[PDB]
Design brief:
part of a larger assembly; 2 chains; mainly alpha; 85% helix; Major vault protein (chains A, B)
């Protein structure tokens, strides 16, 4: 009983702890994608000058 | 019972946790699109001078 309850929970938790990583994987892509679509569209050099303004 | 309830919930939650990412994916596009339609329409050089104003 204690074997087939923790062992069967393990294979269940295995396909869920890895399902958890696929969520974070796809959400990391759309974050980096939408980051890329702004950083280059804004300006590779503009980001540099916009931060260094100190006069 | 505990197999076919958590396993069937897994395939259900799988097609929902990935449905969640498609929402964030399309919303990231319209954000970056509408960002692109303003940043270039405003001025690639204008964004640089508008921030560096310090006199």
């Amino acid at each position: 009983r204690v074997k087939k309850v923790r062992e069967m929970e393990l294979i269940y938790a295995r396909a869920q702890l890895e399902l958890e990583v696929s969520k974070a994987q796809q959400l990391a892509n759309v974050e980096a994608k939408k980051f890329k679509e702004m950083t280059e569209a804004l300006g590779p050099g503009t980001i540099r000058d916009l931060a260094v303004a100190g006069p």
